Amino acid sequence: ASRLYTLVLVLQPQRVLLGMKKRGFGAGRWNGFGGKVQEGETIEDGARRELQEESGLTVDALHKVGQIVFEFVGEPELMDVHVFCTDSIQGTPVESDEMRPCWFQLDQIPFKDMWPDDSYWFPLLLQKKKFHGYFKFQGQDTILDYTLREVDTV
Ligand SMILES: Nc1nccc(-c2ccccc2)n1
């Protein structure tokens, strides 16, 4: 019992784009752009669609970088998050009622204001490593247990 989600990081040589979510699940945290995958849509097509919806940016080629499964204790459905990166975008990041994008220098990534799992796998993303992860949360702040391993094929 898992549900597909996407997460996209626009990662350029000296900066990364994050978005501050204004409402719903994850509100108040910086994160990549993503969401649920639709019926009849490929995971990558869903990732591209969500990037546009939430940031205003058009991506063509997305690179698979990771898969992270999230368990929230007391919730039956696991979240199967497919993580992608891109360095080539078109458009200017757009702030909306749902999302405030901002560029960050790589030495200023706002980990204290991100989901806590990001502190484990974001350093792999920055060094161009691919990974498979599993994080068991209690609520939205506490990691009870986790696994995270580098892989050659996502
Ligand atoms: N970084 C991070 N950590 C935990 C959960 C998520 C998430 C990703 C896609 C959709 C909803 C939540 N992202």
Curated annotation (Swiss-Prot):
Optimum pH is 7.8-8.2 with 8-oxo-dGTP as substrate, and 8.0-8.5 with 2-oxo-dATP as substrate. GO terms for biological process: DNA protection; DNA repair; purine nucleoside catabolic process; response to oxidative stress. SUPFAM superfamilies: Nudix (SSF55811). Changing W115Y: Enhances 2-oxo-dATPase activity and greatly reduces 8-oxo-dGTPase activity. Mg(2+) 1 binds at G34, E54, E98. The lineage of its organism: Eukaryota, Metazoa, Chordata, Craniata, Vertebrata. It catalyses: 2-oxo-dATP + H2O = 2-oxo-dAMP + diphosphate + H(+); 2-oxo-ATP + H2O = 2-oxo-AMP + diphosphate + H(+); 8-oxo-dGTP + H2O = 8-oxo-dGMP + diphosphate + H(+); 8-oxo-dATP + H2O = 8-oxo-dAMP + diphosphate + H(+). Belongs to the Nudix hydrolase family. Monomer. Its EC number is 3.6.1.56, 3.6.1.-. 8-oxo-ATP binds at F25, F33, G34, G35, K36, E50, E54, W115, P116, D117, D118. GO terms for cellular component: cytoplasm; cytosol; mitochondrial matrix; mitochondrion; nucleus. Mg(2+) 2 binds at E50, E53. It is an enzyme of class 3 (hydrolase). The gene is NUDT1. Its cofactor is Mg(2+). Changing V37E: Loss of activity. Changing V81M: Decreased localization to mitochondrion. Changing R149A: Reduces 2-oxo-dATPase and 8-oxo-dGTPase activities and increases thermolability. This is Oxidized purine nucleoside triphosphate hydrolase. It holds the Pfam family NUDIX. The keyword Repeat does not apply. Keywords: Cytoplasm, Hydrolase, Magnesium, Metal-binding, Mitochondrion, Nucleus, RNA-binding, Transit peptide.
